[PDB]
Amino acid sequence: YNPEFFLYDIFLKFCLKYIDGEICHDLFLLLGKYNILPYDTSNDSIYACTNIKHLDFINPFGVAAGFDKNGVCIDSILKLGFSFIEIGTITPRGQTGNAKPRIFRDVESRSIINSCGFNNMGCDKVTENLILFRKRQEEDKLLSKHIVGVSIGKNKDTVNIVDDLKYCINKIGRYADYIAINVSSPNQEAGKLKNIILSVKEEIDNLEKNNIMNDEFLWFNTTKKKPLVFVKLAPDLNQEQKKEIADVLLETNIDGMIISNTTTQINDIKSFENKKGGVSGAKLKDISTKFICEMYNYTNKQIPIIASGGIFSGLDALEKIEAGASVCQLYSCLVFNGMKSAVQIKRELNHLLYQRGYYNLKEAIGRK
Ligand SMILES: Cc1cc2nc3c(=O)[nH]c(=O)nc-3n(C[C@H](O)[C@H](O)[C@H](O)COP(=O)(O)O)c2cc1C
Ligand SMILES: Cc1cc(Nc2ccc(C(F)(F)F)cc2)n2nc(C(C)(F)F)nc2n1
Ligand SMILES: O=C(O)c1cc(=O)[nH]c(=O)[nH]1
């Protein structure tokens, strides 16, 4: 209980009941931009730290893509106690997205429907923002070791999806701790997808070539090493194409997989009966967890997993890991539970880890 968190969460509870979803979002992002949000300055339990390959996360909680699409509020979101943030999904050139209002929420069910249609300032401007953050990070004790990933995607009317992701890697790759391939927005063909992943890895490695500087100056990023490659998957898939994707990921030795994006396969919300778009929140929890189990099966525990979503509590979080999720991303929780989300969930998971018998977090990964 940090007083500052409780005070803001009254205003946020008010904002939730009354104000438009996206207008709130933008206001809080704006607040964070001018550095007036609370910090979590506490020490994270070394027993609860985690990693994906050589990418080390000080704690298992980050913020999902679509939250800070333009990377304007990275410091403050991180400093709420998150280990990482995944900015974007960015596109090569700026987009307005769909028509407003395009995001709607339901308190009762703790869910969100959205059809943003990939609005973002474009790569050039977002890269400009990330550079500015990376400079600050060198002069801020609270941002050390904190991971920033970049979710990349195509424009709504792109000629070929691969050519777009290359342009993005060329601008932002230097400054990303990892790259999340986004082709899972509700708003693929095995070989078509396989082609993409290999393009990305091939394209990242070209950045190391063309530079005359050592890697240490090559990576203006937390790792100081080349970006890892994650792929994000949509849940609305057959047991067949889920098998087909799993091999592709194995054949490309992809660094990890984000499971999962939003669904359209939910019909049982009375306020959502009106609206169009993908759905996230509590009603996505159980569907998303089964998906992780499934993809953990067809992958033989070889490719690490980033979990999302429906994650609101340490309990919810633990399910994902036992299922075998290495790390977790939150989006809906910050909307409903608020600014204490990171502090609350980290605490709750620390308690539960002890009671279940687990020594460290890593021992809980992939245990029924
Ligand atoms: C308004 C909104 C925008 C989103 N934008 C993106 C996006 O641009 N890229 C992406 O990969 N996921 C996006 N997502 C999905 C989230 O990243 C997350 O995976 C999903 O919300 C499920 O997690 P949650 O139920 O805990 O929120 C968006 C979700 C919402 C609600
Ligand atoms: C009140 C509120 C706040 C908010 N966004 C929001 C919540 C926390 C923070 C933090 F950084 F934690 F301070 C920042 C932004 N959203 N987002 C949406 C959505 C779903 F439309 F996208 N509805 C919202 N309603
Ligand atoms: O930009 C969007 O509309 C969007 C992207 C995404 O990946 N997921 C989502 O729910 N919305």
Rounded to whole angstroms, the Cα distance separating 344 from 1 reads 9
Q: Is the CB of 166 under 6 A from ligand 2?
A: no
Which segments of the chain are extended strands (E)? 50-52, 55-57, 61-63, 84-90, 103-106, 111-114, 147-152, 178-182, 228-233, 256-259, 278-281, 305-307, 327-330
* Cβ-based burial of 133 (10 A; exposed 0-12, middle 13-18, buried ≥19): buried
Q: Is the CB of 105 under 6 A from ligand 2?
A: yes
Q: Is the CB of 25 under 6 A from ligand 2?
A: yes
Rounded to whole angstroms, the Cα distance separating 190 from 202 reads 18
Rounded to whole angstroms, the Cα distance separating 363 from 322 reads 9
Task: Give Rg (Cα) of the chain.
Answer: 19
Please name which ligand lies nearest the alpha carbon of 95.
3
Nearest partner of 170 among 195, 200, 140, 142, judged by Cα: 200
Please name which ligand lies nearest the alpha carbon of 12.
2
Instruction: Tell me which amino acid residue 101 is.
Output: P
Rounded to whole angstroms, the Cα distance separating 180 from 172 reads 12
Ligand 2 centroid to 39 CA: how many Å?
Answer: 17
Technique of determination:
X-ray
**Residues within the annotated binding site for substrate?**
69, 114-118, 182, 187, 261-262
CA geometry: angle at 180 spanning 178 and 184, to 5°?
175
Nearest partner of 188 among 238, 243, 245, judged by Cα: 245
Rounded to whole angstroms, the Cα distance separating 322 from 324 reads 5
Q: Is the CB of 72 under 6 A from ligand 2?
A: no
- Determine the angle formed by the axes of helices 239-251 and 285-297, rounding to 10 degrees: 50
Rounded to whole angstroms, the Cα distance separating 294 from 24 reads 36
Residue 185 among the catalytic residues: yes
Catalytic option among 76, 111, 184, 185: 185
Ligand 1, atom 23, lies closest to the CA of 309
Alpha carbon separation from 153 to 94, 220, 365 (Å, rounded): 12, 22, 29
Neighbours of 359 (CB within 10 A): 10
Ligand 3, atom 5, lies closest to the CA of 185
The half-sphere exposure of 287 on its side-chain side, counting CA atoms within 13 A, is 21
DSSP 87-136: EEEE-SS-B--SPSP-EEEETTTTEEEE-----B--HHHHHHHHHHHHHH
Q: What is the resolution of this structure in A?
A: 3.0
Instruction: Tell me which amino acid residue 359 is.
Output: Y
Go through the domains of the chain in sequence order and give each one's CATH number: 1-368 (3.20.20.70)
